Amino acid sequence: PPVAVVTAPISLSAAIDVQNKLHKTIGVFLPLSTFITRATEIANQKLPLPANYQPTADELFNQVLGLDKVTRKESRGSYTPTFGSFVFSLQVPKSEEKRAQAFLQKMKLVLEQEPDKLVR
Amino acid sequence: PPVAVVTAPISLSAAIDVQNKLHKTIGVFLPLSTFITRATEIANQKLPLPANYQPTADELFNQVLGLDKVTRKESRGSYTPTFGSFVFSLQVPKSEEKRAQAFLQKMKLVLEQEPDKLVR
Amino acid sequence: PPVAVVTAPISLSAAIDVQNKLHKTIGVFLPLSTFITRATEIANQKLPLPANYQPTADELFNQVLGLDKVTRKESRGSYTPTFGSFVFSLQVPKSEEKRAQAFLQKMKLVLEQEPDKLVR
Amino acid sequence: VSTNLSVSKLLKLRQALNSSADGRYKLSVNDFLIKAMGIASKRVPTVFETVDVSVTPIVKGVEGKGLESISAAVKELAKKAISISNMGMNPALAVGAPQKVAVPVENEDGTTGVSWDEQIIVTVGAEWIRELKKVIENPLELLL
Amino acid sequence: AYTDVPISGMRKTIAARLKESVTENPHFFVSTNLSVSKLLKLRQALNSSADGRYKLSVNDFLIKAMGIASKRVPTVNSSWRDGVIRQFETVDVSVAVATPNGLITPIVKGVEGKGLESISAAVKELAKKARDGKLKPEEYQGGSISISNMGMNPAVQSFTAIINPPQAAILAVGAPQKVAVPVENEDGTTGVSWDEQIIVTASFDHKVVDGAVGAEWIRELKKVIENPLELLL
Amino acid sequence: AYTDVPISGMRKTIAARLKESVTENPHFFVSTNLSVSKLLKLRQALNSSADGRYKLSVNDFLIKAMGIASKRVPTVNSSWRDGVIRQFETVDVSVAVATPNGLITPIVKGVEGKGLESISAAVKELAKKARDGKLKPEEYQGGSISISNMGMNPAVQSFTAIINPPQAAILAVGAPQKVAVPVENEDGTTGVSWDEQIIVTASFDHKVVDGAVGAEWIRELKKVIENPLELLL
C-alpha cells in the first residue's frame, strides 16, 4: 500500500488580528484551535472523487431505473490536518492524494481572506 | 377553489442601521435575507386557526376521555413571503386568508421595533 | 425521608457590567436569567457520586468481564437553583446533600471570575 | 320533577362515532336517552324485569341492545306509522330544546372565569333522576 | 434408574378427546397484531371513576369484541353435526381456567346483550367455583367459541391451541410488547414513536370455515379493538 | 332455538379431500421476511412506460421468482406416487381464486420460459372464466406448486395453508407492513430508516422434502426477490 504526502504553507496573522480586536471590544477571548476546526468543517463539504471510484449496488440500480439520471461528482469527508506554520501537511494513499489537496487549498483560501466569516 | 391575496407595506431602515453598525465594530457583514428568514421563523409560532376547522379521531377521542379537556386555539405553520418594499404580499385560499394576516402583522411589528433581537 | 438544605451567598455585579457594556457596543440586551441557566448547564457536567451508591446489573457484568476495568467517579445531574442574593439555596435529601454542594460552589466560582465565558 | 343536563360531551361522542362510518347509520340525542332510561329504570325498579319504551310505537329489549339496533327500529316504525316525548325540533318524560348558560371555570392562574356550557331541561323519583343524570354527564358509563 | 407413576383416570378422558380432535378437524391458523394503547387509556379512565363496585380487565373487552365480530360474520358461530350444519343466533364463549387438578372450561352466556360488569362478575364467580371444585356439569358442556390468554407471563409472545370437539374455532392471546412506528411530525418529517402491541392467533376448521371468512373475522375484531368506542354499537 | 341447513353435495367433495390430505401428508412450516421496496419501484417504472397494453402486480413477480427457485432446487418440483417418486422438468403453478360458489384452482403453464405480460393475461382470463362459471375440467387438474395471497386485507399478517393431495409444497403470502432498520449514515453514526416488508410462509411435506432443502428454497426465493434485476437470468 504506497502512501504519499501533500503540504502547503500558511500565514495566521489575520486570525491573530481578529482575536485581539474581539478581545478589546467585548471581552471574548478564544484560542486558534476553534478557528482551525471550524475551517476544517466548512472545508469538508464539496470535494471531488477519485478517478478510480467503484459504485455500489443501490447506485447502479437507481441509475438503470431512472430516478437519479444525473450522477454525482462530490462527496463529503473526514480529514484532520497536522500542526505547523512558517507547514500544513497531510499523509494519505495515492488514490485520494489529489482529493486531499482540494481540502488544503480550500482551507488555505478561507483562512486568509475570510477570517471574519468564522465568527458566530 | 377561490383564492385571495393580502398585502402590507414595510420599512427596512432599521435593519440597514444594525447591519452597518455591526460591520463597523466587529467586522461581521450579513445580508438582509437572514433577517427575513429569522423573522419568518419567530413569526410562525402562535397563529390562530380557521373558524371552519374539523378535528381528527385522536383529538375527539382524547377530549371524550378527559386528558386534554382544555382545547387548543393555536397551531404552527410554514409560510414564505414575497419580496418587495416601498410591498409584502401573500396569496392563500379564503379559509386561511385571515390566519395568513396574523403572520404579516407579527413580522411587520418585530422587524420595525426589535431588529436587535435577531442577533445571536 | 429526612431532608436538608444547603446555602451560599452570591454577588451579581460582574454580570451587570457585562450586560451594560454589551448594550453600549452592539445593541444586544439580554436578561440575567440566561446567565443563570447557562451557568447551570456548564455546572451539571462533573459532580461526584454519593458514597452509598449501589450499581446495576450491566455495570457489574461489564466489570466481571473486563471492558470497563477502570470504574467511574462522576455522573451528570439535573438541578435547578432557588432565586435570591445579598442567597442561593437548594433543598435535597441527606444522601446527595454533599453532591448538591459541589454544584453550588462550581456555579459560585464560574459566575464571579468568568462572566465573559457565557457569551457566544 | 325538573332537572338540567349538560350535553356537551355527549355531542362530541356523537360526532366521533358519526365520522368513522361510511354511510351506514347516523345517531341522535333521542337514541342515547332511550338507552340511559333503561339503565336508571333498572337501578330503581319501582318505576317487571324487561324494559319497554314507547316513542305510539314500541321498542323492545333496550337493555340487551346497542345504538345501531335501537336507531333502526325507531326509524322503521316511524315510517310505517314507560313513555318518552321530545320537542327539541322547535327552539321555542318530556325533553325540551337546547340552550347556552354561563358557568364558572377555575382557571389555573387562580381566579374564576366564564365558560359557555350547553344545557337541556328535562321534566324514588329523585333517585331515578340522579341515576339518569349520572349517565348523561358521564357518557362512558353507557357501556356497563 | 427411573420412576413410574400409574396413569390417572382423568388423564385418559382428555387424552382420547385430544386425539379425536386432531384426526376429526383439519386445522389452519391466522395471525394478527393489535394496538391496545387506547384500550388501556379507556380502562384507566373507567377504573378510577368507580368507588369499589367493580374492576375491569382486557379479557372482558376482548370477549365483547369477539361477540360483535361473531355477530357481523355468523358463519363462524356454527357447528358440524352428523349430516347437517348447525347455525346459532346467540353467542356463548368458553374461557379456560387452570388449576393444579387440571384445566376447566367455565361458560358465559348472553354476551351480545350484556355489559362489562356482568361479564367480569360471572367470570370471577365461575373462576372461584372452579378453583374450589364445586362446579355443576351443565355449566361446562358447550359453547360456540373458545378463548385462551397467557398475558400473565411476559415470556410468551405467541402460541397455538387445539380446537374443542363440537366447536369450529378457537382464539389464543399473547403477552404485550413494544415496537417502533412512524409518526409524521408537524414540522414535515418522520419520527419514531413507541407503540404497545399484542399478537393474536386464531385456529379454524376448514370444513365449516374458509380462509376469506377467517380473514374477515380477524378484520372485524381488529377494527373493534383499535377503535374502542365502537364497542357501544 | 336454532336452524339447520342440509349439507351441500359439493361440500363433502372438499371435506373428504381435506381430511385425506392431513392424514396422508405430514406437514412442517418455514417462515421468512422479504423487503419489497425495490420491487415496487421497478413495478412503478414499468407501469408508466406503457400506453394501456398491460398492467402488472406483485403476484406475477412472485410466480416468476418461484419458477426460478424451483429450477435451482428441483427436489421440490416432485410428487409421491404409489411406489415411485416422480420428478418433473416443467414448472406449473396453481393460483387460488375465491368466488361465492367456492374456491377454484386455475393453472398457469410454462412459467419458466415466459414473461410477466403473458402470465398476467393468463391469470386474468382464467380468473374471469372462473368467476363466470364456464371452466373446463382439464384446466384445474394438476400442478407442482400452489400459491395463495391475502394482501388485499391489511389485517392478515401471516397465515397457514393446507397442501393439495398430489403436490408436495404450498406458499402463503401475507400483507405488507412497515418496520425500522439501521442505516449507517455517512457522518459515521447509525440512524433509523423505515422499510416495507412482507412475511411469507411455506408448508412442506417431509416424505419428499427435508428441512435443509426447504431452507435453501427459501434462500433462493429471497435472493431473487430482494434483488429484482436477477429476474432476467
Added chain:
Amino acid sequence: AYTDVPISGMRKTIAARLKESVTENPHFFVSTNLSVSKLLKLRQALNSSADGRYKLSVNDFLIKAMGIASKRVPTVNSSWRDGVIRQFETVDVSVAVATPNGLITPIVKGVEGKGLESISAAVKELAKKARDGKLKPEEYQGGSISISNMGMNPAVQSFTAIINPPQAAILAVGAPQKVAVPVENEDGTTGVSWDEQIIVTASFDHKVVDGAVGAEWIRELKKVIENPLELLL
C-alpha cells in the same frame, strides 16, 4: 415427459416413522424471542483467553440452558409408554446432523453435570463419525429432548419441527436478526437502540404436557439465556 426413480429402502423407514408420529402425538407450538448480545460478549471473552485448546459456539450454551430448564421443570423430561408414564432424572439431548445420505441423531449424555468444553468435544467427535459413516446403533437410540438449529442460513427466520416417536418435546432455533428497542437516556428522554434477537420455537405433545408447563419451560430458558452468568448455578 418425466422421469421416475425407485424409492430407497431407507426412505420408507423414515416415511413410516414420520407418518406414525403425526397420528400418535397431538402437537401444539409455543414461540419466544431471546436477546443474545450478552451471550455473544461472553463467548468472545472466553474464546480469546485460550491458546488453542477449544472453541465454543451458541449451541453449547443453548444445550446447557436447556438442561437447567429441564431440571427446574421435570414434567417435560418424561415419556409416554403403553400404560404408564416414565419420568427420568438425567438429561440426554439429541442433536441433528445433516449429511447427503440423510439426517442422523447423535446423542450427548450427562449434560446437567458437565461443562461447555466436553459438550463441544463430544458434539464434534460425533459429528465427524456421523459424516464418515461409522456410527454404532446404540449411540443414536433414545433421549429426552431434541434440538434443531438453522442459524447458518440468514433466510430462515422461524420454522417448525416434528417430534420424535418416544419423546415429548422438540426445540427449533432460527437465525439472528436486528430490531429497535427503547432506551431511557440519562438526559430524561427515550431513544432508539439496536438489539440482536433470535426467535425460538418449541413443539410439545398435549398428552404429557400442558400449556402452562410449556410456558414456564420457555420462561426458565429465557431467564437463563438473557442473564448468562446464571449458567454457573
Added chain:
Amino acid sequence: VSTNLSVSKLLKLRQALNSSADGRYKLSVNDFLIKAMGIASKRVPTVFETVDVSVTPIVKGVEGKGLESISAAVKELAKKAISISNMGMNPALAVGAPQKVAVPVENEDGTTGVSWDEQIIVTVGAEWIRELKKVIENPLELLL
C-alpha cells in the same frame, strides 16, 4: 438499412449484474442483442413460430430462455468449433464497434449543453429495426 443505437444504459445494467455474482458467469453485448432479436422478430413475424439464431453454430429457443442459458450455449459451441455477425473486437445483421458522439442536454438552468453518449451503428424492415431499437435504448423491456 442502417441505424444508430445508444448503449450506455445497457453497459450499466451489465455492470450491475456482473458484480452480484461470485464467479458463476459473465455477460456481454452479443447476448443482449440475441434476446432482443427474438422479441423484434416476435412482433414482426414476416422476417415459423420458433426463433433460431446462427452465430456457423446454432442457438435454439431464445424466446423461452434467459441470459444465463444463452451465454453458456454460445461459449460451449464456440469451443467445439436468422444470422448475426459482430466485429466489435477491432475498434477500426452486422454489428460495428462503439464510438462517442456529442448530444444536446437540456440543463435545468434553461440552456443547452454538451454531453458525451456512446453509440454503435447496426446494419416491414423499418418496423423490425424500430422494435429492436426500442428494446435497446429502454433495456427493462427485455423481461416481458
Added chain:
Amino acid sequence: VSTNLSVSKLLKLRQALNSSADGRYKLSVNDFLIKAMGIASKRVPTVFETVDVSVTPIVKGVEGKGLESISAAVKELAKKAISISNMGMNPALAVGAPQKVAVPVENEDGTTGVSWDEQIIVTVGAEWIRELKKVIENPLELLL
C-alpha cells in the same frame, strides 16, 4: 507451599449473582474454592476419578455440580453436626483472612500509580497451586 490470591473480581461476581435472586440462596467464598479445588485436582490427578471434599462432613460429586447444590449441602450438613479449612471469620488446604496491598497500575498517561488490591494467603504441588490460582484470578473459567 504458600501463595497469594487476588479475589476482587470474585467478590464482584458474588455480588452480581446475589442480587438477581429473590431470597432463594446466598453464596460465599468457600463455595467457590471447593469447586475450583475439583478443577485443580482434575488437571493434576496425582494429588481416583471422583472428587470428595471434607469440610468433618463430606460433599460428593463436586465436578458434576453447581454452586446452588454445593451451598445447600454445606449448610444442611453443618446444622446436623481431600480436606479444606477456613479461618476467614477472624481478621486476626488452609485459608486465611483478607487484607489490602498496594500494586502498580500502568496509567494511560505513561507513568506508574498506586492501586489497592484485596488479597488472601493460601497454605506436582506447584502445578496444583498454579491451576487453582488460574481459576481464582480469572473466575469465568469455572464454567468449563
